Amino acid sequence: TYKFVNMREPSMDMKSVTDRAAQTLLWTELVRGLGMTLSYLFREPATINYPFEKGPLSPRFRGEHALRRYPSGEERCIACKLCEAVCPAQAITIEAEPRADGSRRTTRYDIDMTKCIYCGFCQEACPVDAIVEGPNFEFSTETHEELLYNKEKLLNNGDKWEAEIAANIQADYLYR
Amino acid sequence: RGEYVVAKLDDLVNWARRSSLWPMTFGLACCAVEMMHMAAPRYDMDRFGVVFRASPRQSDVMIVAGTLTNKMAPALRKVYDQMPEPRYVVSMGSCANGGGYYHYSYSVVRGCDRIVPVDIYVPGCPPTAEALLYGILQLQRKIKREKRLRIWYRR
Amino acid sequence: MNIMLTLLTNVTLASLLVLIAFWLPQLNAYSEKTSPYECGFDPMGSARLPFSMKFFLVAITFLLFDLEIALLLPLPWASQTNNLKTMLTMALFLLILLAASLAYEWTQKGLEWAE
Amino acid sequence: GTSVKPIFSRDMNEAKRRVRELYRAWYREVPNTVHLFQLDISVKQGRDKVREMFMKNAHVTDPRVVDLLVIKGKMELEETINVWKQRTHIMRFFHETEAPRPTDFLSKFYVGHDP
Amino acid sequence: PPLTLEAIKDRVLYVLKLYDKIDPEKLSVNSHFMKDLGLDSLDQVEIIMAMEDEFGFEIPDIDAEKLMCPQEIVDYIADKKDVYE
Numbered sequence: 001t002y003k004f005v006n007m008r009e010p011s012m013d014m015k016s017v018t019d020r021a022a023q024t025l026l027w028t029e030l031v032r033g034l035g036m037t038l039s040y041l042f043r044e045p046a047t048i049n050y051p052f053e054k055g056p057l058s059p060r061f062r063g064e065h066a067l068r069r070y071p072s073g074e075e076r077c078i079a080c081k082l083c084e085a086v087c088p089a090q091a092i093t094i095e096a097e098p099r100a101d102g103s104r105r106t107t108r109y110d111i112d113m114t115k116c117i118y119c120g121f122c123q124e125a126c127p128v129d130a131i132v133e134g135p136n137f138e139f140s141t142e143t144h145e146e147l148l149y150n151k152e153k154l155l156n157n158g159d160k161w162e163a164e165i166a167a168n169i170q171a172d173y174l175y176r
Numbered sequence: 177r178g179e180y181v182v183a184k185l186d187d188l189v190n191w192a193r194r195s196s197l198w199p200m201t202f203g204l205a206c207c208a209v210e211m212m213h214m215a216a217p218r219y220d221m222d223r224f225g226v227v228f229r230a231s232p233r234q235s236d237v238m239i240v241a242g243t244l245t246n247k248m249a250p251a252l253r254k255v256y257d258q259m260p261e262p263r264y265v266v267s268m269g270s271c272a273n274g275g276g277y278y279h280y281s282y283s284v285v286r287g288c289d290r291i292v293p294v295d296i297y298v299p300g301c302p303p304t305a306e307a308l309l310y311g312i313l314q315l316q317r318k319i320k321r322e323k324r325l326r327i328w329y330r331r
Numbered sequence: 332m333n334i335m336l337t338l339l340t341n342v343t344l345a346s347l348l349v350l351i352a353f354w355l356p357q358l359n360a361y362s363e364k365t366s367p368y369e370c371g372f373d374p375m376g377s378a379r380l381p382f383s384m385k386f387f388l389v390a391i392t393f394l395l396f397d398l399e400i401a402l403l404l405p406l407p408w409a410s411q412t413n414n415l416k417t418m419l420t421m422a423l424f425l426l427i428l429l430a431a432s433l434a435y436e437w438t439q440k441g442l443e444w445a446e
Numbered sequence: 447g448t449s450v451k452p453i454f455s456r457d458m459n460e461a462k463r464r465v466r467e468l469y470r471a472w473y474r475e476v477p478n479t480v481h482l483f484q485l486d487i488s489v490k491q492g493r494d495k496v497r498e499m500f501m502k503n504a505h506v507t508d509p510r511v512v513d514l515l516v517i518k519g520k521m522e523l524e525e526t527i528n529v530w531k532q533r534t535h536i537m538r539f540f541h542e543t544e545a546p547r548p549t550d551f552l553s554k555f556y557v558g559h560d561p
Numbered sequence: 562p563p564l565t566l567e568a569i570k571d572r573v574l575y576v577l578k579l580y581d582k583i584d585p586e587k588l589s590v591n592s593h594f595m596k597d598l599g600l601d602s603l604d605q606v607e608i609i610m611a612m613e614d615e616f617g618f619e620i621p622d623i624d625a626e627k628l629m630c631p632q633e634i635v636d637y638i639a640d641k642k643d644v645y646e
């Protein structure tokens with residue numbers, strides 16, 4: 001099924017041609033164009049009052065990366081390196097070393113925000129829900145080096161946004 | 177006292193600069209689309225005093241939005257040179273920040289900072305238009321904290 | 332008395348605004364800053380070589396057309412004469428000849444731009 | 447087996463002819479690059495660099511190879527002519543910002559573990 | 562005025578002398594570039610170019626390689642503009 005978008009021949013009756021000449025001389029579709037914009041000025045604007053008003057999001061939103069931890073206090077990360085092995089941009093660097101207690105934890109877990117693509121592949125690959133993409137997105141920095149995240153900075157993000165991230169995962173883990 | 181007078185002059189000049197930041201139409205890649213969406217009715221750059229303007233001669237802030245490649249870097253540096261001072265560079269997106277997805281490619285500049293002095297680093301791939309608006313407001317506060325005439329008084 | 336005092340006021344106000352615009356802002360100039368703007372990349376190099384204008388015929392006949400309005404403009408005072416028949420005939424003569432000139436140009440390519 | 451298709455030339459002499467005319471074009475061009483591109487290197491300081499670039503790959507003996515670099519040099523000339531390369535692109539031939547590298551074994555041993 | 566082998570020879574010697582890689586005293590009418598002067602064929606390229614530009618007319622590549630020594634240079638530039646003493 002196809003339709004001819006522009007295959008309309010105009011009628012050549014005296015009334016039709018008089019109307020076409022009137023539209024040409026007395027600009028008619030031009031007045032319609034004016035009227036449409038008049039109708040929308042009288043309409044309500046769509047602008048929101050940022051930063052006092054924020055655009056809507058979803059619990060699945062991908063933002064600032066963060067390392068979570070168990071309710072006991074121990075970090076969830078076990079240095080299985082799935083996130084490092086699955087990152088499309090190779091933005092994660094992990095070095096592991098058996099801790100004094102014996103549990104295997106990262107001696108270095110750096111995520112480079114200037115190289116990250118915010119795909120969320122790491123948070124899917126993680127088998128313990130250790131690394132997540134937090135809800136934060138207003139974390140712009142004045143210098144480049146501040147975007148090269150360390151293990152300590154990611155742990156601070158996890159401890160800061162934990163209230164939001166726990167609820168976000170709680171409202172989405174069933175879909176996964 | 178002279179310090180108070182130069183202080184007030186600083187506040188006036190900084191307020192003008194921050195309240196009429198005129199950006200440049202230098203969208204490069206997908207990061208430009210969000211650069212358009214904050215110009216879209218929802219976020220509307222215009223209410224914050226920022227109005228898009230080409231012809232670098234009459235613009236202040238450059239939002240490098242998109243991947244900066246080797247073939248384009250001379251053009252970007254030259255165009256940054258055309259901007260009369262004061263000038264500011266806002267880097268949108270991971271590609272313009274440090275390389276992004278194609279950080280290991282053969283024809284991509286590994287960060288816009290290597291070509292121009294970037295003033296605000298906006299992260300994202302692409303950054304949400306809210307995040308870019310936040311970066312612009314951060315630049316606005318930066319201009320607010322300038323101390324030009326104070327330093328001149330303590331030359 | 333009044334008209335040149337006015338003109339002087341406008342020109343000195345403009346020259347002043349230029350002066351404050353050009354001496355106050357504390358400019359810092361270097362060679363690449365004043366380099367000609369050519370959508371980024373360096374210009375091929377010209378900006379004074381001949382630039383073809385295909386309406387050259389149209390541009391020049393504008394001169395004759397705008398010239399005729401000099402003959403045309405005395406009409407508001409010409410209507411208030413005692414020989415309205417001759418004035419009407421001559422005014423319609425000017426307008427008819429301008430119509431004939433425009434029609435001759437229209438038919439003999441004329442107003443159509445060169446390629 | 448030992449005998450294969452030719453690119454442009456059918457012997458080394460014709461390849462040398464093409465190299466000769468390519469050098470002709472480059473040598474004639476050089477001052478036009480110096481002026482048009484607003485370069486600061488002396489005219490001779492570009493002509494000798496053209497000579498050095500030609501002398502770099504002066505060891506090749508396969509004709510098809512010679513035609514290949516003839517085409518490549520023709521393309522670089524094409525880019526240089528209609529301001530497709532820029533000042534930075536041309537200046538890359540003179541490796542300016544690169545620190546001079548040492549040739550003796552002793553300095554290499556002093557500086558790092560490389561061949 | 563019309564000019565002959567004298568003017569062609571002296572202009573050839575001149576614009577062959579301004580070349581730096583040429584040597585002032587081994588320069589001669591009989592000084593073959595490859596043999597006496599010790600040049601490169603690439604050098605012969607701007608020998609023949611210094612011929613053409615000051616001599617006005619261009620000389621093609623079909624014949625440039627044949628001219629390998631100042632006599633042949635002067636002879637060729639003589640037969641071009643019909644110099645018959």
Ligand SMILES: COC1=C(OC)C(=O)C(C/C=C(\C)CC/C=C(\C)CC/C=C(\C)CC/C=C(\C)CC/C=C(/C)CC/C=C(/C)CC/C=C(\C)CC/C=C(\C)CC/C=C(\C)CCC=C(C)C)=C(C)C1=O
Nearest residue numbers: 201202203204205206208211212215222227228344347348
């Ligand atoms: C298909 O893929 C594509 C890409 O893919 C990667 C791309 O990247 C891109 C490229 C990307 C882009 C182009 C980015 C997107 C851009 C946009 C969508 C554009 C959005 C634009 C806007 C939101 C703004 C539009 C502007 C509007 C509506 C209006 C602008 C008008 C104005 C007037 C602005 C204000 C400016 C000025 C100069 C006015 C201010 C001046 C004054 C008031 C001066 C006053 C002075 C005085 C009062 C002086 C007084 C003096 C006095 C009294 C005395 C003086 C005398 C003395 C002696 C001193 C594209 C296009 C693309 O398609």
Ligand code: SF4
Nearest residue numbers: 087117118119120122
């Ligand atoms: S979400 Fe960020 S850190 Fe995780 S895999 Fe993607 S780019 Fe890497």
Ligand code: SF4
Nearest residue numbers: 077078080081083126
């Ligand atoms: S996938 Fe999770 S547990 Fe494995 S190394 Fe990455 S953050 Fe740690």
Ligand code: SF4
Nearest residue numbers: 242269270271301302
């Ligand atoms: S940072 Fe991401 S969104 Fe921005 S240009 Fe690079 S790949 Fe595209």
